């Protein structure tokens, strides 16, 4: 309800004062700290602000950073001398690799979401950090089996996924369609999640621009993946009927 009628310049005004403008003197001069807040501002824009206003476009980390710098003249002095040092850091920063899975039903209109125990823990896709010497596919299989009890070893495809760097994490969620709706999900392996329920894709905020956006339930790192997932399912239904 906050950013329902907010222009893109006002959104950049808010994220500027909220994240990067009011840091102490020594923190603003730090490339690491300034980049850290921009990544947080990007995640805050994708996960929260876009859900309240579908008119705002979905942007990548590097694209969002460029528009925010030109928006605020207070960073024009900084970005002019620290241009090469920031662009090299924004690309080559060591980020936490997180792997997961977007399990869809046979009709590809319902997905599996998981929720934690905390009161503010929102729904999200089953994902988690990678271990040492672990493969990308092996990490996604482990996190799904631990958080949902389902073994997607025989169904996961290393080429069907959505990769995105958000909030300082290299996230890759493997799209797995055709999951039976009668699957009994028992997360006995990990007691840090509470519920595992199928969610209609049309009920998520940004998936259905025609539907009235009502956000009664909380979602964490689900909205930014809806735009590629909507494009992914659109190409699969065409490829299935060609």
């Amino acid at each position: 309800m906050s950013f329902t009628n907010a222009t893109f310049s006002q959104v950049l005004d808010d994220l500027s004062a909220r994240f990067i403008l009011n840091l102490p003197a020594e923190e603003q001069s730090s490339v690491e700290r300034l980049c850290f807040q921009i990544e947080q501002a990007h995640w805050f824009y994708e996960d929260f602000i876009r859900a309240q206003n579908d008119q705002l476009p979905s942007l990548g980390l590097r694209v969002f950073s460029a528009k925010l710098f030109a928006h605020c003249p207070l960073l024009w002095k900084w970005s002019k001398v620290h241009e090469e040092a920031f662009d090299d850091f924004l690309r080559y920063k060591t980020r936490i690799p997180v792997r997961g899975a977007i399990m869809l039903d046979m009709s590809m209109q319902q997905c599996v979401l998981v929720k934690g125990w905390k009161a503010s823990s929102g729904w999200g896709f089953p994902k988690g950090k990678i271990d040492k010497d672990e493969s990308d596919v092996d990490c996604a299989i482990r996190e799904v089996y631990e958080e949902t009890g389902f073994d997607c070893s025989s169904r996961i495809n290393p080429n069907e996924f959505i990769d995105m760097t958000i909030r300082g994490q290299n996230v890759r969620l493997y799209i797995i369609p055709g999951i039976s709706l009668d699957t009994r999900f028992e997360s006995r392996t990990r007691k840090e999640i509470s519920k595992i329920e199928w969610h209609n894709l049309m009920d998520l905020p940004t998936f259905k621009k025609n539907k009235p956006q009502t956000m009664k339930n909380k979602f964490y790192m689900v909205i930014p993946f809806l735009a590629p997932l909507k494009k992914w399912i659109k190409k699969r239904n065409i490829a299935n009927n060609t």
Partner: protein, 126 residues
């Protein structure tokens, strides 16, 4: 790209954002860099930490009321509370206790210790 004073310009867009969320805000009194919000449980048990954490804006209302806004870095749900009487705000260790709205206890942990006492002395003046 000339700017005769970057701090005045920084506080100009600061008030611009606060008015965008709360039009009843008239001016900014003071700013604190980083502030975490703690909430005392009504069951009188322990000192629970709230998920609210961001920049602290000491703000003055159109009715000359003195409150504060906290732009949360973790959620769009901000914190907007008014200080009706200075007898509701105390300073214990590195916290800023505030008893608002009949029975409720919120604790503001500020990152810079100099900001806590400065805000506390301003609050004691209306």
């Amino acid at each position: 790209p000339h700017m005769e004073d970057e701090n005045i310009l920084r506080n100009a867009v600061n008030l611009q954002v606060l008015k965008f969320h709360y039009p009843e805000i008239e001016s900014i009194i003071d700013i604190a860099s980083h502030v975490a919000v703690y909430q005392f449980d009504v069951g009188s048990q322990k000192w629970l930490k709230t998920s609210i954490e961001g920049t602290f804006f000491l703000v003055k209302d159109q009715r000359a009321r003195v409150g504060y806004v906290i732009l949360n870095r973790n959620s769009p749900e901000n914190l907007y509370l008014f200080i009706n009487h200075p007898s509701n705000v105390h300073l214990v260790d590195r916290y800023l206790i505030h008893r608002t709205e009949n029975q409720h206890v919120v604790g503001l942990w500020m990152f810079d210790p100099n900001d806590m006492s400065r805000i506390f002395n301003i609050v004691k003046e209306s």
